[PDB]
Amino acid sequence: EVDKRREINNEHPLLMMPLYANGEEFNQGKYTFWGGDTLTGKWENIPDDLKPYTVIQLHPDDLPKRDGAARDFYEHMLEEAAKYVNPKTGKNEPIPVILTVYTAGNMPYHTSAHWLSTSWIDKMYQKYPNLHGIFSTASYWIWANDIENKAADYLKVSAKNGGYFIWAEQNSGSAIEKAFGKNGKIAFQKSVDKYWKNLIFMFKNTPAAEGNDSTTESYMKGLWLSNHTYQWGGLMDTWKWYETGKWKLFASGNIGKSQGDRQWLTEPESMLGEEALGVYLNGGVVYNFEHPAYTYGVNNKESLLFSEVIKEFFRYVIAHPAPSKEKVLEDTKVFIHGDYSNKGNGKFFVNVNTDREQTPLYMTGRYNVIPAIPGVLKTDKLKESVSSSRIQIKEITSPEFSSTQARKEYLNKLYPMNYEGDIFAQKLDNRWFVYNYKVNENVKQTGKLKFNSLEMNVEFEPHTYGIFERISNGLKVNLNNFRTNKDSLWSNAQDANQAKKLPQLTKKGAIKWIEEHYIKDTQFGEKRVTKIVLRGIDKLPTIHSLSGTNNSYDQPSLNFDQKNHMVTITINSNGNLEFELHFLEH
Numbered sequence: 001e002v003d004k005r006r007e008i009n010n011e012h013p014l015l016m017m018p019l020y021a022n023g024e025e026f027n028q029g030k031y032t033f034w035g036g037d038t039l040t041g042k043w044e045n046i047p048d049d050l051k052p053y054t055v056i057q058l059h060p061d062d063l064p065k066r067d068g069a070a071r072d073f074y075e076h077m078l079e080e081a082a083k084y085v086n087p088k089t090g091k092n093e094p095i096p097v098i099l100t101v102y103t104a105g106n107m108p109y110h111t112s113a114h115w116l117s118t119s120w121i122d123k124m125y126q127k128y129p130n131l132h133g134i135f136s137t138a139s140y141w142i143w144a145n146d147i148e149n150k151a152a153d154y155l156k157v158s159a160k161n162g163g164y165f166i167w168a169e170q171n172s173g174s175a176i177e178k179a180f181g182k183n184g185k186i187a188f189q190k191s192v193d194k195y196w197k198n199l200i201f202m203f204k205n206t207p208a209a210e211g212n213d214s215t216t217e218s219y220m221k222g223l224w225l226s227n228h229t230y231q232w233g234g235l236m237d238t239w240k241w242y243e244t245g246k247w248k249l250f251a252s253g254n255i256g257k258s259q260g261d262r263q264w265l266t267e268p269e270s271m272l273g274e275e276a277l278g279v280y281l282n283g284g285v286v287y288n289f290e291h292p293a294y295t296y297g298v299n300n301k302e303s304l305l306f307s308e309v310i311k312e313f314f315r316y317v318i319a320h321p322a323p324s325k326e327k328v329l330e331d332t333k334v335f336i337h338g339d340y341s342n343k344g345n346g347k348f349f350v351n352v353n354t355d356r357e358q359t360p361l362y363m364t365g366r367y368n369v370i371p372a373i374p375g376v377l378k379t380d381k382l383k384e385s386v387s388s389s390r391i392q393i394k395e396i397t398s399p400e401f402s403s404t405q406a407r408k409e410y411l412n413k414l415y416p417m418n419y420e421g422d423i424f425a426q427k428l429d430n431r432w433f434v435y436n437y438k439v440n441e442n443v444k445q446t447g448k449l450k451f452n453s454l455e456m457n458v459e460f461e462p463h464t465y466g467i468f469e470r471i472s473n474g475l476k477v478n479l480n481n482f483r484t485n486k487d488s489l490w491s492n493a494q495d496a497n498q499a500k501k502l503p504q505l506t507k508k509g510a511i512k513w514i515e516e517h518y519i520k521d522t523q524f525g526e527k528r529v530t531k532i533v534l535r536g537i538d539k540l541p542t543i544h545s546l547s548g549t550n551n552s553y554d555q556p557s558l559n560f561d562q563k564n565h566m567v568t569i570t571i572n573s574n575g576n577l578e579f580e581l582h583f584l585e586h
């Protein structure tokens with residue numbers, strides 16, 4: 001094994017920072033990115049505490065579909081990355097880069113990435129120490145003849161160079177199962193047997209109408225735990241709102257896939273945090289997002305989604321490393337072996353831990369994410385683990401998994417009920433993670449959580465998550481309900497029929513919308529109420545280190561009832577929020 005070019009794990013997580021090549025401007029002789037970011041500009045803007053954990057992911061987007069175009073663009077940007085000089089110190093500090101080398105089956109009619117050979121990739125790895133890895137993304141919808149053979153070569157060349165091969169894929173049409181050899185294409189399976197320590201596998205939650213979120217994430221987790229991948233994560237995509245046909249927030253009716261560029265702007269900001277929690281809480285450590293202009297920003301500026309949600313979330317997972325593989329292994333009670341493709345795909349988990357077929361969220365943390373691997377693989381490396389002896393490894397074909405009811409009945413024996421209320425909650429050490437799991441329905445949710453004898457009741461509007469940590473002198477609270485008002489995008493439409501018929505915003509229009517109405521002149525949403533009730537408190541708690549999104553919250557309101565040893569905390573807010581309550585138990 002060659003020395004890894006970087007570490008990627010719970011203590012060293014990774015945020016991919018996508019930059020998408022502007023092919024129209026390339027045709028005009030210019031080297032630029034859609035949304036106006038520049039390689040150097042964007043890197044400099046990345047907060048210094050985040051720099052060791054972020055990598056620039058170049059994507060060839062709509063570069064010309066002919067030989068040389070992607071090589072020429074990529075070489076230009078690699079040169080820029082390599083030669084970067086930190087203006088503060090004057091020293092040459094090469095920017096870490098990942099290249100997107102495979103997408104849309106690398107079809108010559110889909111992507112300029114077709115004309116990027118393994119030999120050229122090897123050459124770049126040897127020429128650029130700052131090239132940390134290569135990226136394959138979204139071929140589930142065009143599963144090319146030799147995709148497995150090519151993935152084997154990408155993993156091998158990455159290992160040869162100590163770089164990572166990162167593959168982001170969703171289990172549509174059995175994609176994850178096929179990747180590991182289900183249909184007899186086994187080159188990647190054999191590659192993985194040798195080179196798994198250089199592989200990252202990620203979900204890509206884009207094609208949301210097919211409902212493969214829970215199953216893909218279960219695979220990513222299980223592949224990791226069973227040593228088929230070095231780490232895992234997810235690419236969370238605001239385009240899910242388009243794929244599922246949604247429009248104005250909470251509005252009734254479905255418009256199908258008809259207003260793409262309005263639709264990818266509409267997902268509530270805080271909901272990206274709710275999706276990301278499913279990665280973190282289950283030991284994942286790699287994060288990436290689309291649409292880049294909404295989730296990250298434009299013109300080397302951070303969008304509010306990035307500044308108020310993703311940045312703050314990512315800082316949290318650095319400060320509190322995800323559960324290690326050893327830890328997750330110890331907590332795992334059930335591990336599924338087999339193909340979700342013949343057990344209803346996403347339907348497998350509906351009314352088990354998801355509330356509907358098309359969602360990226362969970363309705364309970366009781367089982368967290370049940371890990372799994374495709375039937376084609378073996379559980380050998382799993383069983384060889386010291387931490388895996390208390391795990392039940394079960395075939396997906398077992399009678400215990402044959403219906404919704406049998407699953408719940410089986411899982412409930414092994415995963416005890418550990419909170420009350422129709423709301424998402426999962427516990428890790430001294431921390432309760434809570435979120436309202438409604439996607440597009442304006443319904444409050446409530447839960448009752450305990451820290452031993454201390455009772456905490458919460459009431460959350462949709463698109464709200466919290467992290468409640470029992471500390472020695474009280475309770476640390478992180479809250480996020482940041483949701484701006486996107487109604488202006490759906491102006492002039494009073495119903496689904498009129499919305500479907502709006503003029504297209506277009507790619508360029510949506511980028512301009514961001515510049516003119518999101519980066520500035522933002523239509524912030526209304527402040528909204530969160531309630532926390534603590535029972536078993538001695539005296540009126542005190543509040544410390546209160547901060548959050550500028551102008552986004554009223555002072556929290558504490559109402560202590562001596563007789564009943566309890567406090568009611570009312571928060572009115574829209575953004576990220578943080579404070580500590582100090583108190584003693586009664």
Ligand SMILES: CC(=O)N[C@@H]1[C@@H](O)[C@H](O[C@@H]2O[C@H](CO)[C@H](O)[C@H](O)[C@H]2O[C@@H]2O[C@@H](C)[C@@H](O)[C@@H](O)[C@@H]2O)[C@@H](CO)O[C@H]1O
Nearest residue numbers: 059103104110137138141206207208239240242243260290
């Ligand atoms: C030929 C064709 O139309 N292919 C579609 C893909 O391009 C789509 O992928 C992503 O989908 C969203 C809409 O949900 C949007 O069109 C994105 O541009 C697209 O993502 C880009 O293209 C991919 C091929 C990847 O290279 C990705 O990194 C890019 O950002 C899928 C959605 O499931 O539908 C196909 O039909």
